[PDB]
Design a protein around this ligand. Sequence first.
Ligand SMILES: [Zn+2]
Lengths: 277, 400
Amino acid sequence: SIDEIYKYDKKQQQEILAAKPWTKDHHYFKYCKISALALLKMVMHARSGGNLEVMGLMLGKVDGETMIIMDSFALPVAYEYMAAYIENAKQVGRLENAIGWYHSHPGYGCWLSGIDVSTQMLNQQFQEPFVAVVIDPTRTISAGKVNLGAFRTYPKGYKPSEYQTIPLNKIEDFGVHCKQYYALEVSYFKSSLDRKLLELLWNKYWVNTLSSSSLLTNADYTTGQVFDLSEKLEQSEAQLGDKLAKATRDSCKTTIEAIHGLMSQVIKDKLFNQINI
Amino acid sequence: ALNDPKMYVQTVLDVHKKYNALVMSAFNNDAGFVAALDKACGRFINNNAVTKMAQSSSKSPELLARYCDSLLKKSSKNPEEAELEDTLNQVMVVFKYIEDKDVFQKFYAKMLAKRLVHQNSASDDAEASMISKLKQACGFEYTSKLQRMFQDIGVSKDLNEQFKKHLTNSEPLDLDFSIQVLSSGSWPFQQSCTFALPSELERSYQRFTAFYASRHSGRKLTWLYQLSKGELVTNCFKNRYTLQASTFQMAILLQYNTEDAYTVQQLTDSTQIKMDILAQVLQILLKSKLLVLEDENANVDEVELKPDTLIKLYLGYKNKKLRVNINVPMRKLLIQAAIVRIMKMRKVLKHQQLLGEVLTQLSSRFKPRVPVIKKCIDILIEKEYLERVDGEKDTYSYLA
Ligand SMILES: [Zn+2]
């Protein structure tokens, strides 16, 4: 039956909030579990603004080293409207409180800006569990895959690459504000049961899958991945003379995606072209 | 001080100078003596007590402008340009201590306009020196209005002497014509009262416009008859009288060319002058006793100036004064929030680049105008908000 993500346990949440285990170690949070509804609403709001920028809050809880997100609600926008709409979190009947904020970067990669990192610093300083989601609408529309942006920042006065596609303009902002935040591994959870049963509506499409036009839809994504892998491997070599394991994993995922696209193309060719010859 | 602020200003000048000399002799930069200086000059001088219950507070910091006006205005024997310059030099030092310098440039510009247009300015060469000193205080933008006012005075002076040369090639004018062309958008003056030009002054008028058509193309002329004067002589009286009067009084007097008496209504209809202005002109003319009515016993005060009384020119005019001169004078808070909001994202921004991003992005409501935004950004950067760059170009930065 698995599940067990739901059934918000108030006592455990209060205990983990009062313990404050992330104050001692800065790299406490490493895994971000976004829900299906969270992603659906986030991407819908991100694309419902086109090239304009949208932002809202996302509700969830904390379990050990993972931060689970169950819901997300948009915002009207800096004026009194946003503050008035914030009361929705405590006005409705829901036990998930609030865990962070999401905001879109329409065509500017997935990194965190200077104002973004400053707001995240403030939010972490006075609201201990907080994460920032920096999803990109244009990239997921063009490439057909969703890129995630869980980018929790570091504390002030403390000292301790993936979507590097910004050609000219905002790459300067990327370089200066790069060590001020660390990415979180995004691992999606499906509630199973009802949603797993109802996911048959994806099977209803059956045409975008049969004609996917892969390997050209996200050609720029693969070229960027290879470009990142090149200096990842160069850094692994410099250290060697485990970054090599990470470079090997990245190469394996990129190659697996390429071979999956080729397999889809071969299946389509066998299904359609090799009939009535 | 309110009644005669002339000697009040002179008191401040004398006290300040002597304070420096006494300290360096024996005190050797005493802490107590220096501290007491900054507390006395600020509160007691900048804003005095009687500005509250007299419903006059804006005029108090504006008495410095009229003092400098008196030095550059045509008057009796004035101090030479050897001791006056050094007193004006220390005036520049104390001027930067005041925070509302904007009102200083307004009142001095209005007072300079009345001094220049009426030829009442003295030492016009020294006037250029005074304005040049004000340029170094803030910049050419601060004195943008003032410099144009002085420039067109010189242009009109050369224009008049060129017009005289043009007169020799044509029929000579029966009267000496001089005109200050002034400029539009840089002067406080504006045409407000309609006027019917007398038939005697029309021809010269036309002549000048011809001279302004060949010399300049695509330029109009908004004549200000309320600011124009002239000299009119009488050739039928017992004695020659060369009176000096404005254009309105000139037209009123010239209306008696064909007849001897006129009623107020005909004067209003023929010259198309507004009721209030014409009433004031008629009253000041009656003060000089140039025009009289039938009933001497009638009092002008308790009897209203109805537009039916028949005033006739006084043919036996023998007024005891030969020097008659009737030419004597008769909270928004949105733009600051917008500025800080737009400076939030961009740490460093130019002044004019910031302008427009706030000036006209929200222009659909409450058109803010440049000076309001300039003043608001000044009072913002004053209170530890923008802290502009130390001099590298004109970037305003943020917390840098
Ligand atoms: Zn952002």
